[PDB]
Design a binder for this molecule. Structure first.
Ligand SMILES: [Mg+2]
Ligand SMILES: [Mg+2]
Ligand SMILES: [Mg+2]
Ligand SMILES: [Mg+2]
Ligand SMILES: [Mg+2]
Ligand SMILES: [Mg+2]
Ligand SMILES: [Mg+2]
Ligand SMILES: [Mg+2]
Ligand SMILES: [Mg+2]
Ligand SMILES: [Mg+2]
Ligand SMILES: [Mg+2]
Ligand SMILES: [Mg+2]
Ligand SMILES: [Mg+2]
Ligand SMILES: [Mg+2]
Ligand SMILES: [Mg+2]
Ligand SMILES: [Mg+2]
Ligand SMILES: [Mg+2]
Ligand SMILES: [Mg+2]
Ligand SMILES: [Mg+2]
Ligand SMILES: [Mg+2]
Ligand SMILES: [Mg+2]
Ligand SMILES: [Mg+2]
Ligand SMILES: [Mg+2]
Ligand SMILES: [Mg+2]
Ligand SMILES: [Mg+2]
Ligand SMILES: [Mg+2]
Lengths: 203, 123, 123
RNA sequence: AAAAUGUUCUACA
RNA sequence: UACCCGCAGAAGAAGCACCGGCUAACUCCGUGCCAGCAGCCGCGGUAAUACGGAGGGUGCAAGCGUUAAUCGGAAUUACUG
RNA sequence: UUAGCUAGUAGGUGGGGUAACGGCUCACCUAGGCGACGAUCCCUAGCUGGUCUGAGAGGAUGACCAGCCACACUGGAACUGAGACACGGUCCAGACUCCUACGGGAGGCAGCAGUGGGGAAUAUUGCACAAUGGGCGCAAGCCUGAUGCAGCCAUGCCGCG
């Protein structure tokens, strides 16, 4: 469920390794009855190389697959892009994220009161501001930027919608930040699994 | 006869020097706390290294009042100042381990027998 | 250089500071691993060096190297640090003593054992 | 007249 | 008690560090910039006398290494200089 | 990268005080005294013989042993006394520990062992006053965790296997 294939800070060989490990995981999920779908996919200098990848899995068997793959993936291969480089231990990271959220229901609750900063007798006395509250959210707004109750109530509906939209936005943005931070917490050492050669020959 | 905003001295060694009653507990619209009464306090002054800290909101039992206590024969015992013993919010047991100055018999009850025992003198 | 100049202001000796200040001139210090992790050596080396962030009895919060192959250290492990910088890990000026208080000896090691806390194998 | 930058470790007593 | 005499029998009694240069002492195997070493210079990415084991060797030895600390080397506060 | 400090302060007279000189203290008078040859202030620290290192000059150091100093739960104070402002004396105050019949009392291992704690780390709740030394005593003798010894530890040096 929502893995993140990353080459951390490793070079184009780590990106190629991300592309090969993604294919290998495709093949394993298919033979193990799990479906794999790419969601976010960033590429390296070469089109066949993968800077990073975001993956959606499915099922209870998906958890077993994610447990077999999460961690550091080591690829033992001499560089195909740098002929006599010397380093041959490109390391990957695979880490599940579960960037999931629920669409809290439209259960807005309205309370219409007087307005702040009145300016006038009929205003001092009329109740035209509308304070809206999203139940099971914690979002309470107070719209008074109009002459009449009804316009404020409509603006309050739009503003509850907009504040839930932001809540979504900061939520997804914190997931963004977490996903990049994954790219900096990948220990290029103890491999969960090690593949060798130019054809990922073992597991 | 302690009410909200009243500053009490601290008859224990919890660390606080001055506390303020912010609520007289035990009844709607209750005005005053005498000796033996539990009040809510905020700590206004404390020693640098004590069990309690400045600004802490906790409980206290009033042990001395300048208003005094009446006895069944009509006698009254007054004190030069108002003083309380700090108590834990939940357990309502004293926080300090030492009671300073005298206390009175109105504390003689299972709630504050520890205070009574620790007190140097009980009027 | 002049004798008069030296009389007025003598040869000031170069004060030398310790490169193991957290030991406070102690051969070893006991500490608690606040965390155990791996890091990358600086150029031109490549590895996961195993280090522990350790809080010592004297309050210092330092990073220590965990030498030998394999270790059993986790958080809240109580270890000894002896000092001695690991050149290619910047900011790592102490070594964990293998075989001291929580840190195991290195498994199946046969030579330079005393350096790794390994008991003499019996045959 | 105008002319910017440059990838990486590099072997050999 | 020291000390002396008798008894039995080689019996009861050897480890630690190091071996690329500094610095005395080198090979094989495992490993493949991993694991690891390291005081410095630096080693390790398949032919590693530098990692880990073994054989051999070197130094010390009921001790041997490491860490800390002071002086030395440092004429690197220089009076000598 | 602390430059000014000082009013009993510096000196004098006199009185008092001390075992004794003395601003030691007091009264009065004078207006001085210290400071760049570092006063004052701040931080650190027991000092020495010595110890380690060093060719030496130096640098570092002051564990043990010996001389000196200071301290004796913290802060004060005096008493007794030849000698103390007194480790195992007194008085007071404070913190802490304890006893209490709640009125009030008790205590101080930085003596030797030992315990807990702290710590990387440092030992036995031993034997004996036989010796040396000390107190008291005419002496016998008593007392002496000084001391002599023993225990534990490769902690060091040396010797041996
Ligand atoms: Mg108007
Ligand atoms: Mg109206
Ligand atoms: Mg060795
Ligand atoms: Mg550019
Ligand atoms: Mg050689
Ligand atoms: Mg080695
Ligand atoms: Mg190679
Ligand atoms: Mg090889
Ligand atoms: Mg070598
Ligand atoms: Mg030196
Ligand atoms: Mg010199
Ligand atoms: Mg006189
Ligand atoms: Mg001191
Ligand atoms: Mg010299
Ligand atoms: Mg004490
Ligand atoms: Mg005292
Ligand atoms: Mg007298
Ligand atoms: Mg004295
Ligand atoms: Mg005593
Ligand atoms: Mg003792
Ligand atoms: Mg102990
Ligand atoms: Mg301890
Ligand atoms: Mg014992
Ligand atoms: Mg005797
Ligand atoms: Mg006796
Ligand atoms: Mg011995």
């Amino acid at each position: 469920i929502l893995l993140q294939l990353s080459s951390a800070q490793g070079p184009e060989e780590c990106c190629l390794a991300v592309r090969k490990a993604l294919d290998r995981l495709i093949k394993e999920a298919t033979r193990q009855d799990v479906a794999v779908t790419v969601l976010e996919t960033e590429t390296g200098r070469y089109s066949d190389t993968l800077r990073s990848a975001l993956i959606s899995l499915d099922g209870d068997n998906a958890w077993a697959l994610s447990e077999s793959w999460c961690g550091t993936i080591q690829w033992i291969c001499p560089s195909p892009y740098r002929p006599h480089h010397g380093r041959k231990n490109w390391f990957l990271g695979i880490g599940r994220f579960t960037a999931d959220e629920q669409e809290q229901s439209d259960a807005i609750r309205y309370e219409t009161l007087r307005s702040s900063g009145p300016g006038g007798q009929h205003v001092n006395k009329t109740d035209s501001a509308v304070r809206a509250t999203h139940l099971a959210s914690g979002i309470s707004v107070k719209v008074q930027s109009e002459r009449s109750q009804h316009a404020n109530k409509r603006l309050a509906r739009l503003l509850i919608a907009w504040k839930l939209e932001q809540q979504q936005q900061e939520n997804s943005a914190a997931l963004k930040s977490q996903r990049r931070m994954f790219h900096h917490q990948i220990e290029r050492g103890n491999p969960r699994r090690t593949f060798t050669g130019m054809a990922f020959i073992e597991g | 006869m302690i009410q909200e905003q009243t500053m009490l001295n601290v008859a224990d060694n919890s660390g606080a020097r001055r506390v303020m009653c912010i609520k007289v507990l035990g009844g709607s619209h209750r005005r005053y706390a005498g000796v033996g009464d539990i009040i809510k306090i905020t700590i206004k002054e404390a020693i640098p290294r004590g069990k309690v800290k400045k600004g802490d909101v906790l409980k206290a039992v009033v042990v001395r009042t300048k208003k005094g206590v009446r006895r069944p024969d009509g006698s009254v015992i007054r004190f030069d100042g108002n003083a309380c013993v700090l108590l834990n919010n939940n357990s309502e047991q004293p926080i300090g381990t030492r009671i300073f100055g005298p206390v009175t018999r109105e504390l003689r009850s299972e709630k504050f027998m520890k205070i009574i025992s620790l007190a140097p003198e009980v009027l | 250089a002049t004798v008069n100049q030296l009389v007025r202001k003598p040869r000031a000796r170069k004060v030398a500071k310790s490169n193991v200040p957290a030991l406070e001139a102690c051969p070893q210090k006991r500490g608690v691993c606040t965390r155990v992790y791996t890091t990358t050596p600086k150029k031109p080396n490549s590895a996961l060096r195993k280090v522990c962030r350790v809080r010592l009895t004297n309050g210092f919060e330092v990073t220590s190297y965990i030498g030998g192959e394999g270790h059993n250290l986790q958080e809240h492990s109580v270890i000894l640090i002896r000092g001695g910088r690991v050149k290619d890990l910047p900011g790592v000026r102490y070594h964990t003593v293998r075989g001291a208080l929580d840190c195991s000896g290195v498994k199946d090691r046969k030579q330079a054992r005393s350096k790794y806390g390994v008991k003499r194998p019996k045959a």
